[PDB]
Write a protein that holds these residues in place. Structure first.
Motif, PDB file in Angstrom:
ATOM      1  N   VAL C  52       0.889  -1.523  -0.310  1.00  0.00           N
ATOM      2  CA  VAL C  52       0.046  -0.727   0.205  1.00  0.00           C
ATOM      3  C   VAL C  52       0.879   1.559   0.246  1.00  0.00           C
ATOM      4  O   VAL C  52       1.796   1.026   0.540  1.00  0.00           O
ATOM      5  N   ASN C  53       3.859  -8.300  11.308  1.00  0.00           N
ATOM      6  CA  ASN C  53       2.920  -9.400  10.362  1.00  0.00           C
ATOM      7  C   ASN C  53       3.152  -9.313   8.601  1.00  0.00           C
ATOM      8  O   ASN C  53       2.160  -8.321   8.241  1.00  0.00           O
ATOM      9  N   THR C  56       0.329  -8.563   6.266  1.00  0.00           N
ATOM     10  CA  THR C  56      -0.660  -7.481   5.079  1.00  0.00           C
ATOM     11  C   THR C  56       0.194  -7.981   4.221  1.00  0.00           C
ATOM     12  O   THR C  56      -1.349  -7.225   3.318  1.00  0.00           O
ATOM     13  N   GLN C  60      -3.598  -8.131   1.429  1.00  0.00           N
ATOM     14  CA  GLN C  60      -3.462  -6.736   0.738  1.00  0.00           C
ATOM     15  C   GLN C  60      -3.402  -7.627  -0.842  1.00  0.00           C
ATOM     16  O   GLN C  60      -4.527  -7.678  -1.537  1.00  0.00           O
TER      17      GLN C  60
ATOM     18  N   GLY D  47     -11.412  -0.181  10.840  1.00  0.00           N
ATOM     19  CA  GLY D  47     -10.546  -1.386  11.552  1.00  0.00           C
ATOM     20  C   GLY D  47     -10.535  -1.992  10.783  1.00  0.00           C
ATOM     21  O   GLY D  47      -8.867  -2.581  10.889  1.00  0.00           O
ATOM     22  N   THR D  48     -10.888  -2.454   9.308  1.00  0.00           N
ATOM     23  CA  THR D  48     -10.383  -3.111   8.396  1.00  0.00           C
ATOM     24  C   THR D  48      -9.872  -5.110   9.015  1.00  0.00           C
ATOM     25  O   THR D  48      -9.494  -5.187   8.661  1.00  0.00           O
ATOM     26  N   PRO D  54      -2.054 -12.388  14.054  1.00  0.00           N
ATOM     27  CA  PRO D  54      -3.363 -11.218  14.167  1.00  0.00           C
ATOM     28  C   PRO D  54      -4.682 -10.058  12.739  1.00  0.00           C
ATOM     29  O   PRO D  54      -5.452 -10.076  12.683  1.00  0.00           O
ATOM     30  N   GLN D  58      -8.078  -9.906  10.018  1.00  0.00           N
ATOM     31  CA  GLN D  58      -8.033  -9.286   8.126  1.00  0.00           C
ATOM     32  C   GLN D  58      -8.298 -10.330   7.914  1.00  0.00           C
ATOM     33  O   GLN D  58      -9.163  -9.882   6.888  1.00  0.00           O
TER      34      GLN D  58
ATOM     35  N   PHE E 236      -5.934  -2.203   3.682  1.00  0.00           N
ATOM     36  CA  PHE E 236      -5.885  -3.024   4.837  1.00  0.00           C
ATOM     37  C   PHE E 236      -4.530  -2.194   5.957  1.00  0.00           C
ATOM     38  O   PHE E 236      -3.542  -2.516   5.725  1.00  0.00           O
ATOM     39  N   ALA E 237      -5.273  -2.326   7.650  1.00  0.00           N
ATOM     40  CA  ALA E 237      -4.366  -1.804   8.768  1.00  0.00           C
ATOM     41  C   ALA E 237      -3.755  -2.650   9.339  1.00  0.00           C
ATOM     42  O   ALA E 237      -4.146  -3.566   9.373  1.00  0.00           O
ATOM     43  N   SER E 238      -2.381  -2.107   9.191  1.00  0.00           N
ATOM     44  CA  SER E 238      -1.117  -3.484  10.629  1.00  0.00           C
ATOM     45  C   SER E 238      -2.269  -3.108  10.850  1.00  0.00           C
ATOM     46  O   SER E 238      -1.475  -1.935  12.359  1.00  0.00           O
ATOM     47  N   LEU E 239      -1.958  -4.045  12.359  1.00  0.00           N
ATOM     48  CA  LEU E 239      -3.157  -4.520  13.977  1.00  0.00           C
ATOM     49  C   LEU E 239      -1.771  -5.445  14.737  1.00  0.00           C
ATOM     50  O   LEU E 239      -1.223  -6.298  13.479  1.00  0.00           O
TER      51      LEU E 239
END
Ligand SMILES: *[C@@H]1O[C@H](CO)[C@@H](O)[C@H](O)[C@H]1NC(C)=O
Ligand SMILES: *[C@@H]1O[C@H](CO)[C@@H](O)[C@H](O)[C@H]1NC(C)=O
Ligand SMILES: *[C@@H]1O[C@H](CO)[C@@H](O)[C@H](O)[C@H]1NC(C)=O
Ligand SMILES: *[C@@H]1O[C@H](CO)[C@@H](O)[C@H](O)[C@H]1NC(C)=O
Ligand SMILES: *[C@@H]1O[C@H](CO)[C@@H](O)[C@H](O)[C@H]1NC(C)=O
Ligand SMILES: *[C@@H]1O[C@H](CO)[C@@H](O)[C@H](O)[C@H]1NC(C)=O
Lengths: 130, 107, 240, 240, 240, 130, 107, 130, 107
Positions: C52, C53, C56, C60, D47-48, D54, D58, E236-239
């Motif tokens: 754009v 863990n 992720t 994506q 939040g996605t 984690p 997602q 998607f956000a990284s959490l």
């Protein structure tokens, strides 16, 4: 049964104005349209004009386009025809004929005159003489 | 103004014989011609409301046919009560006009 | 309902209508950069990751890769849906010439009268008649004529607020015709099933025989089921 | 095959058919809760992540978000597929009036004879004739008449277990008509290509000229390809 | 444009065409093994994981599970698209019998003349005429005949390199007919709207009244929108 | 060529019963239908009745609806018609005519009688006299 | 029961002249009338199996026409072997009936 | 206005060959086709042959299929006809008539001869005598 | 070779009377017959290019009708300038042929 009662015979001096009435009984008066047909003695039927009370839309024949005024009174369920500047040739039996098919559905005009006139009045003999 | 003309001015036929009345027009009435029957000192009576549609309460012997310029009224059997004047009326568009009535008489 | 008993030959005003005659930034960097309004998506096929863990980028990529393939399908599907409708438009135009009212009633999803004036279509509204008064006649034979008999059944009805009872001829889609000029030469052993409202009136030898409900006669299964299988709801389990 | 040589005017019993006339819990908590039978899915756009490593939430969100968008497309696609079929149903009904057998043979995916009795369709079965016996005649001229000549070619054939040879007229879709009453006024320089089985018989001046295979004449490409691109199989690589 | 002014009755050579008449390895191991060219995908529903960072198998499963469902949908969608086109092929074939040129012009996306020779369609090309020269006549009444008047408007035009001015009758889709034999009985209060190029020429009582642009008359909305909703681009956000 | 051989001439006393036979040779007897037609001397052809052997479906004319029985024997490929209560008016040449088009495809009845009768038999002159 | 009536009871024409036989019906036979030719002391021979379809082995001079109520059989040229009785048969529905034969004779 | 000027009258001895010319002025000579029609004295028009200059395609009547050669010269915009083995019966007024509708659009042949001939030449009287 | 035949060899009518010329063919000309008018010592003049379409510059009184085998040319009113020979020409396919001209004269 829809019955149309016309006015009585009236001898009118030439140049006078005659107002023949036609009362509708037994059906809606405003929705349908009444045609005024004139038959001179020993002559064929001659359409004079037609009016629809709901819209007060009156169509007249060219011959009387100027001296003919066809009105309608919803309150008396009566339609009237007025011929002005009467001349000998105006002598005849005026007839009020209601169109066979409905001419108006609410505020929408219909082509009920395409199916002719089913109920005719007895007729009024207007003799124009002095 | 559409102009309609009845072909026969007067028709004399024997009782039982058929009688055809023709009503022509300069333009197209598009199946909007009505046939009426008038007896001396009586109001006209509608026989065929459309070009070919017979009105209720009219002896079936009275039949109509035709479209546009040509139209016809046929009585299958002339009967004593068929002796009257028959007028064809254009109903396509104002000013509505009546054709010269045809005098049907016992021969 | 959609098509109530109605007379569609009295309308004096028709609205004129016409059929229509006439009906992304990726830069290689095998990395490919796609510009988004708030970000830039870098997709690597060999990488199997979209930027754009560690998942992720893979997550994506998963959504982005399915997003591209599905949106390319939705474009191919759309392109063909259009070429299909451009044809169905010609079919409807040809059908209107054969019969205008039925086609225009379909295109409006409502009963409307239609007449073709030159290359335009005049669409008007019908005159509804009292459903209760509408009643078919048992006899389907023209009076005074043995050889000729009404092709369709005659109907006795009345207008909304008009006491007078009119006599017409039942047409298709519950449309009564004031002019009873629809007729045919009488045929031996002639059986006709005519739909009036929610009933099919069987006529044998131009004489009414029986009145059956619509379900009495089987329905043709023209509908082509798409068998759309909606995505199932999978609850992913947490593993290690 | 689908349409064998057959006589479809002898059937005495037809089945009557009629065209049909008439053809989620999300609560905001920007969290939105969707009730599943065994669980509740909480979807957060900001939040996605979707709540039933984690990535688990997602990954759930990815599938759930695509699930919603795809199932919404499948609903919009379905809604339009139905409105399309409701039209094609009117088209087929109009087409049956023009020609019932061809339309009903299409709706049944099998050769069937169809006649329209009033507003219902009587569907019957045809009488198959021996494929080997079927043979077209070279002359298309009506005997004893130079001016009149058969519009379609005459065919000599025989029934399955019947020795007698009948003489009929070839129709469309390999349908032989016992009555050879199809004829037209003779035309100068008239060339006709008629399909019989897997051959197209060329007739010049109402006289047979040549018999070519179907591939001889080019096929109109009416089919609108959807170019459906199936999802590719990507093997995600493990990264860190 | 797609349909320029043209004469489609002069072509001497037509190309003959015909409508077409005739138009995975999973082994249980609840593990299921799917063979790929470079790998084997093992899908576990209870596992919620697909085997070619614990998410890798889940991410693979997500894409693989969506891949199966979307590809099964694309197969069901395709199967129905085909059954639909097989019907639209019969419809087009029936329509060509009613009118060949319009249907074949649609199937070619270009103006082409078409005549039906037996069971084949002879498709030829039209003779384009100078757009500037094309001009309609105000009078639509047959000379020397009050009762008979041209059903469609007469047009004065000239060929590409020919100085001579021809007189024809406007047809549909800007097609001029050299033979002005299209005529009808004169009708009272007859109003016709005829499309010529980008203008609709209104004729009242067989006499030209006004020339309006195409936008003057409303366009029928036959097109059935699919409302295709393209997949949105979620970052998607990284959490943790 | 399908040939139908009828029985010979039989003078029958009034009130007797005559059963004329018609053997089919050269074609499928059961599938096709045989029509019995009677032509009285100096009179036009008069359809008496028709039967289809496969479905043993026999349709008779109203005049003989009560005294006429048309049967068919598949084994002898012969169709037999019996007229009971014979009266002088019954004197005529009875004819057995096979329908031109097949009347039955398996267990499905066909309208093969719409194309007329192609093969006829010699004819049995039955004279009713004492 | 459909009732068929042959318009001409008998027809006399010279050799070479055309001969027309009419067969009308009260209802619609829908192209299911058959024409037969019978010679003294001979079995009737089918000429036109359908309303217009001529049977094989019949001289082309014999031709049929007509649908529903009206039907017609025409002999292009009367020849010495055309001297016989011609019967029209309704085949639409039982009871099937034969129309009175027309006696064609050399004039 | 397209005008076709033909050659002048030429008395030819029998067995000679005559070549009548027809110049086109005021229109595209090559695209359209010229038909040669011969009217013998006190006789009806008789089509002799037709040619299209662009495709040099010449169709001739059977009677002259062997002795008639119709040519066209684009440079002189002139079409010619040569009748060989002249006999007394050949005496007539030869006419060059241009087809009303275009016969060729580029390299594509058109059916412009279906609409007849609009422009005719004055005609050439060939008298075959010695 | 299609063969066309004009029904009337010569027609004589009074100024004002209608005149009908018939042109039949062995095969189908499919609306490709043309009508011409030729005056003594003059080139023929095209009146009806197609079966019914009238050529420009031709008095409207000249009308044409017909298709396939049958074709007709009708002059609404015979006028002094209508005295000529009228030839019908098949234009369906080569060899094109002209029918024997009909000599219209004033009676
Ligand atoms: C009939 O009369 C009622 C009562 O006045 C009125 O509400 C209704 O609108 C009328 N009908 C129509 C179609 O207008
Ligand atoms: C799929 O669609 C067909 C019709 O095209 C239908 O017969 C079949 O039952 C469907 N299968 C399903 C719904 O699983
Ligand atoms: C896509 O569909 C069109 C027809 O809509 C077809 O011509 C084309 O070949 C297909 N495939 C590609 C690669 O464009
Ligand atoms: C969806 O499609 C329908 C037609 O099926 C259309 O009327 C509508 O505007 C489209 N969009 C929305 C927002 O519903
Ligand atoms: C034809 O005859 C054979 C042999 O008896 C039989 O098996 C078959 O079913 C028959 N076919 C039909 C359609 O009657
Ligand atoms: C018209 O003439 C021009 C100039 O020679 C040429 O380029 C063009 O192709 C011609 N168009 C035709 C023959 O249709």
């Amino acid at each position: 049964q829809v019955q149309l009662v016309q006015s009585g015979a009236e001898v009118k001096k030439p140049g006078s104005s005659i107002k023949v009435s036609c009362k509708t009984s037994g059906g809606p008066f405003s929705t349908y349209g009444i045609n005024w047909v004139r038959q001179a003695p020993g002559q064929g039927l001659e359409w004079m004009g037609w009016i629809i009370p709901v819209f007060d839309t009156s169509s007249f024949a060219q011959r009387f386009q100027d001296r003919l005024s066809i009105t309608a009174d919803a309150s008396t369920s009566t339609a009237y025809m007025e011929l002005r500047s009467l001349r000998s040739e105006d002598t005849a039996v005026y007839y009020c004929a209601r169109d066979r098919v409905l001419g108006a559905h609410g505020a929408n005009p219909l082509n009920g005159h395409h199916y002719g006139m089913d109920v005719w009045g007895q007729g009024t003999t207007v003799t124009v003489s002095s | 103004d559409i102009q309609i003309t009845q072909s026969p001015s007067s028709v004399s036929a024997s009782v039982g014989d058929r009688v055809t009345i023709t009503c022509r027009a300069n333009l197209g009435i598009s199946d909007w011609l009505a046939w009426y029957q008038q007896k001396p000192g009586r109001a006209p009576k509608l026989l065929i409301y459309a070009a070919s549609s017979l009105e209720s309460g009219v002896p079936s012997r009275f039949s109509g046919s035709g479209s546009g310029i040509y139209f016809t009224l046929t009585i299958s059997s002339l009967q004593p009560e068929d002796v009257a004047t028959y007028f064809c009326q254009q109903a396509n568009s104002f000013p509505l006009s009546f054709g010269g009535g045809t005098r049907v008489d016992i021969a | 309902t959609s098509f109530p008993f109605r007379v569609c030959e009295l309308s004096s005003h028709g609205d004129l209508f016409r059929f229509s005659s006439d009906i992304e930034n990726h830069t290689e960097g095998s990395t490919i950069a796609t510009e988004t309004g708030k970000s830039i998506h870098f997709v690597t096929d060999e990488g199997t990751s979209s930027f754009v863990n560690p998942a992720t980028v893979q997550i994506q990529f998963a959504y982005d890769s399915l997003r591209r393939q599905i949106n390319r399908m939705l474009g191919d599907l759309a392109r063909a849906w259009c070429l299909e409708q451009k044809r169905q438009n010609m079919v409807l135009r040809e059908l209107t010439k054969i019969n205008p009212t039925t086609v225009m009633s379909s295109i409006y999803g409502k009963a409307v009268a239609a007449k073709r004036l030159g290359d335009v279509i005049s669409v008007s509204q019908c005159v509804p008649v009292n459903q209760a008064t509408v009643t078919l006649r048992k006899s389907m034979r023209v009076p005074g004529s043995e050889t000729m008999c009404y092709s369709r059944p005659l109907v006795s009805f009345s207008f909304i607020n008009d006491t007078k009872t009119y006599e017409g001829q039942l047409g298709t889609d519950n449309e009564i015709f004031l002019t009873k000029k629809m007729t045919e030469v009488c045929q031996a052993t002639s059986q006709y099933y005519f739909q009036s409202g929610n009933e099919i009136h069987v006529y044998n030898d131009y004489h009414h025989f029986k009145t059956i409900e619509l379900d009495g006669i089987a329905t043709l299964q023209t509908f082509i089921s798409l068998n759309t299988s909606l995505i199932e709801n999978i609850d992913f389990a947490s593993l290690e």
